Write an enzyme that holds these catalytic residues in place. Structure first.
Site, PDB file in Angstrom:
ATOM      1  N   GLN B  60      46.978  44.599  31.792  1.00 47.96           N
ATOM      2  CA  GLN B  60      48.256  44.076  31.318  1.00 47.96           C
ATOM      3  C   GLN B  60      48.083  43.109  30.152  1.00 47.96           C
ATOM      4  OE1 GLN B  60      50.635  42.267  34.386  1.00 47.96           O
ATOM      5  NE2 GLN B  60      52.351  41.816  33.009  1.00 47.96           N
ATOM      6  N   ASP B  61      47.380  42.004  30.375  1.00 47.34           N
ATOM      7  CA  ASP B  61      47.345  40.959  29.371  1.00 47.34           C
ATOM      8  C   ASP B  61      45.917  40.481  29.139  1.00 47.34           C
ATOM      9  OD1 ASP B  61      49.151  39.087  27.725  1.00 47.34           O
ATOM     10  OD2 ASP B  61      47.843  37.665  28.771  1.00 47.34           O
ATOM     11  N   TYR B  63      42.848  37.721  27.661  1.00 44.25           N
ATOM     12  CA  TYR B  63      42.451  36.398  28.131  1.00 44.25           C
ATOM     13  C   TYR B  63      42.502  35.428  26.959  1.00 44.25           C
ATOM     14  CZ  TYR B  63      41.062  39.024  32.214  1.00 44.25           C
ATOM     15  OH  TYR B  63      41.062  39.843  33.319  1.00 44.25           O
ATOM     16  N   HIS B  64      43.492  34.535  26.987  1.00 44.43           N
ATOM     17  CA  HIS B  64      43.887  33.743  25.829  1.00 44.43           C
ATOM     18  C   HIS B  64      42.918  32.624  25.483  1.00 44.43           C
ATOM     19  CE1 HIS B  64      45.174  30.537  28.580  1.00 44.43           C
ATOM     20  NE2 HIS B  64      45.587  31.528  29.349  1.00 44.43           N
ATOM     21  N   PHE B  74      40.459  43.874  32.524  1.00 41.59           N
ATOM     22  CA  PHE B  74      39.925  43.077  33.638  1.00 41.59           C
ATOM     23  C   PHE B  74      38.507  42.577  33.364  1.00 41.59           C
ATOM     24  CE2 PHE B  74      42.850  45.304  36.949  1.00 41.59           C
ATOM     25  CZ  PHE B  74      43.917  44.553  36.490  1.00 41.59           C
ATOM     26  N   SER B  85      40.346  37.952  40.114  1.00 41.93           N
ATOM     27  CA  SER B  85      40.760  39.263  40.583  1.00 41.93           C
ATOM     28  C   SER B  85      39.619  40.255  40.484  1.00 41.93           C
ATOM     29  CB  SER B  85      41.958  39.760  39.787  1.00 41.93           C
ATOM     30  OG  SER B  85      43.026  38.833  39.854  1.00 41.93           O
ATOM     31  N   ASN B 120      43.038  47.951  28.216  1.00 40.77           N
ATOM     32  CA  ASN B 120      44.165  47.031  28.161  1.00 40.77           C
ATOM     33  C   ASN B 120      45.353  47.712  27.502  1.00 40.77           C
ATOM     34  OD1 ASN B 120      43.386  44.492  29.364  1.00 40.77           O
ATOM     35  ND2 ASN B 120      41.941  44.244  27.664  1.00 40.77           N
ATOM     36  N   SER B 163      53.116  46.692  39.302  1.00 40.48           N
ATOM     37  CA  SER B 163      54.283  47.370  38.757  1.00 40.48           C
ATOM     38  C   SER B 163      54.225  47.541  37.247  1.00 40.48           C
ATOM     39  CB  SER B 163      55.555  46.610  39.130  1.00 40.48           C
ATOM     40  OG  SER B 163      55.610  45.359  38.470  1.00 40.48           O
ATOM     41  N   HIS B 184      48.533  44.492  44.031  1.00 42.31           N
ATOM     42  CA  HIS B 184      47.761  44.037  42.889  1.00 42.31           C
ATOM     43  C   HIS B 184      46.414  43.495  43.368  1.00 42.31           C
ATOM     44  CE1 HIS B 184      46.960  41.956  39.036  1.00 42.31           C
ATOM     45  NE2 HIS B 184      47.856  42.789  38.541  1.00 42.31           N
ATOM     46  N   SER B 186      45.043  40.852  42.320  1.00 42.01           N
ATOM     47  CA  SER B 186      45.109  39.406  42.363  1.00 42.01           C
ATOM     48  C   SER B 186      45.478  38.920  43.762  1.00 42.01           C
ATOM     49  CB  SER B 186      46.136  38.882  41.364  1.00 42.01           C
ATOM     50  OG  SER B 186      46.295  37.477  41.490  1.00 42.01           O
TER      51      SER B 186
END
Lengths: 116, 220, 79
Positions: B60-61, B63-64, B74, B85, B120, B163, B184, B186
Site C-alpha cells: 500500500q504505502d 516508508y517515509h 513490505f 508486520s 508496492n 481491503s 491484515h 499488521s
C-alpha cells in the site's frame, strides 16, 4: 474574638498570646489558603504531548513522582524540572501512587494489568 | 530497468496519465524529497524476471523515513531494524515450516528470487510523510501491470490481505489461479483472521495444483 | 540529599517483542469492554496516517491506554 483585619491582629498578637484572640488562627488560614499562583508546569516532551495520570511528592519533597498513561512513573526535580529516572512500573497505567514516610516503600496501583 | 519485462509493456506509455506521473514526481524530486530514488523503483523489474512470477503480493504505502525502504513491498533496508508486520508474518512461518530459520534483518533479498511479485501499489511517497500525494499515476500504471499478467504469464496467487489489495485484483479467474484473502498482517487489524491461518503453505501447496518452478521459504 | 534509586526493575529490552507481547493484550481487553466498531475504525484512521512505521504501533497503545484509563475513571463499570 480576634479582629477581622490582619494588621489589627498583628498589633494585637504583640501583647496577647499565640494568634491574637478567640478564633484567631482561623482568620490566619482564610488569608493564606485563598490564594494560589502557578510556579512551574511539568510537560512530558517525549511524544510532544503529555500523558500523565497520577501525581504525588516523594518522602523528602525533592522529587515529585508523576505517573504516565503508559504505566511508568517518571521522577522530576522540583527545582530543576528535569527528567531524572523513569521506571517501567506497570503495563496499563498508574491509578494510585503514594510513598511511605520513611522513604523505603512505595505503593502503586494500575488500571487493568494482571498484577493490579 | 529490465528490457524483457517491457516485451509487451510498450502499452504502458501512451495514456493521458503517464506523463502526469514521470514528470510531476520528477518535479516533486525537483522541489521536495519523495523518498525512494529512481535507482530503487526499478529493483523488482531487475532482480527477478517476468518468466518465473508465481506469487502476487501488493503493497500500500512506502516508508517515509530516510534510509529505510528500497522499492519492494513490505520491505526495508538491511541495517534498518525489521518492520513489525514483516515481523508478524514470521510468526506463522515458524508454526508451518518446521525448519524455521531466522532472517535477522529487514532486507527481503532472499524471497525475491523465488517467484513473489513484491510490488508496492504507489511506488513513491514523500520523506517523513505517509499519504501526501494524490493519484498522480502510480495506481493505474500498476493496474495495467497486474491485470496484464492475467494474460501472458501464468501460475500466480493472490494473498490480497487487507481491503486496499481487495479492490485492485479480486475479479481474476479461479480456474487458472487461486485467490485466498484474510485479515491484515499488521497487529493493528482488530478484526482477526490473520492470527493463525496457515496460508503460507499455499505458496508451496497451490503450486502442486500447477506444477511450476518450486519455492523454499527458508532462503534467508 | 535524595538519592533516586537504581532502576533494577522489570526492563523491556525487546521493544519490538514486548510491544507484540502487549499490543494483543491491549486488544485483549478493549474488546472485553467495547464493540469492535471504534476499534477497527480508529486503527484504520491511524494506519491511513501513520502506517506500518511504529508511529501508530506505539500510538495505538497510547490511545488505547489513554481511553481504557479514563473509561475506568469516568464511572462506567465496563465501557
Amino acid at each position: 474574638q480576634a479582629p477581622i483585619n490582619f494588621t489589627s491582629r498583628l498589633n494585637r498578637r504583640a501583647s496577647f498570646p499565640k494568634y491574637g484572640g478567640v478564633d484567631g488562627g482561623c482568620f490566619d488560614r482564610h488569608l493564606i489558603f485563598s490564594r494560589f499562583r502557578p510556579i512551574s508546569v511539568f510537560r512530558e516532551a517525549n511524544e510532544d504531548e503529555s500523558g500523565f495520570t497520577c501525581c504525588a511528592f516523594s518522602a523528602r519533597e525533592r522529587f515529585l513522582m508523576l505517573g504516565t498513561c503508559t504505566g511508568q512513573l517518571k521522577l522530576y526535580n522540583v527545582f530543576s524540572g528535569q527528567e531524572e529516572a523513569s521506571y517501567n512500573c506497570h503495563n496499563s497505567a498508574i491509578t494510585h501512587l503514594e510513598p511511605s514516610r520513611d522513604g523505603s516503600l512505595l505503593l502503586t496501583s494500575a488500571t487493568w494489568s494482571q498484577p493490579l | 530497468f529490465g528490457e524483457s519485462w517491457k516485451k509487451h509493456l510498450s502499452g504502458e506509455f501512451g495514456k493521458p496519465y503517464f506523463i502526469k506521473l514521470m514528470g510531476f514526481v520528477a518535479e516533486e524530486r525537483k522541489h521536495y524529497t519523495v523518498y525512494p530514488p529512481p535507482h530503487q523503483v526499478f529493483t523488482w523489474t531487475q532482480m527477478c524476471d517476468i518468466k518465473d512470477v508465481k506469487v502476487v503480493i501488493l503493497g500500500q504505502d512506502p516508508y517515509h523515513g530516510p534510509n529505510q525502504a528500497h522499492g519492494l513491498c513490505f520491505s526495508v533496508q538491511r541495517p534498518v531494524p525489521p518492520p513489525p508486520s514483516l515481523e508478524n508474518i514470521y510468526k506463522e512461518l515458524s508454526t508451518d515450516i518446521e525448519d524455521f530459520v531466522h532472517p535477522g534483518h529487514g532486507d527481503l533479498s532472499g524471497w525475491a528470487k523465488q517467484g513473489v511479485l513484491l510490488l508496492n501499489a504507489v511506488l513513491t511517497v514523500r520523506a517523513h510523510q505517509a499519504n501526501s500525494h494524490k493519484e498522480r499515476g502510480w495506481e493505474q500504471f500498476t493496474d495495467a501491470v497486474v491485470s496484464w499478467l492475467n494474460q501472458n504469464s501464468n501460475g500466480l496467487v493472490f494473498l490480497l490481505w487487507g481491503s486496499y489489495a481487495q479492490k485492485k485484483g479480486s475479479a481474476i479467474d479461479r480456474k487458472r489461479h487461486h485467490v485466498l484473502q484474510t485479515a491484515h498482517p499488521s497487529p493493528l487489524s482488530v478484526y482477526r483472521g490473520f492470527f493463525g491461518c496457515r496460508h503460507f503453505s499455499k505458496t508451496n501447496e497451490l503450486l502442486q495444483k500447477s506444477g511450476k518452478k518450486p519455492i523454499d521459504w527458508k532462503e534467508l | 540529599m535524595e538519592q533516586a534509586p537504581e532502576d533494577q526493575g522489570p526492563q523491556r529490552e525487546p521493544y519490538n517483542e514486548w510491544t507484540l507481547e502487549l499490543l494483543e493484550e491491549l486488544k485483549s481487553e478493549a474488546v472485553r469492554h467495547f464493540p469492535r466498531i471504534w476499534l477497527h475504525n480508529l486503527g484504520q484512521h491511524i494506519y491511513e496516517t501513520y502506517g506500518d512505521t511504529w508511529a501508530g504501533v506505539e500510538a495505538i497503545i497510547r490511545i488505547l491506554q489513554q481511553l481504557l484509563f479514563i473509561h475506568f475513571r469516568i464511572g462506567c463499570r465496563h465501557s
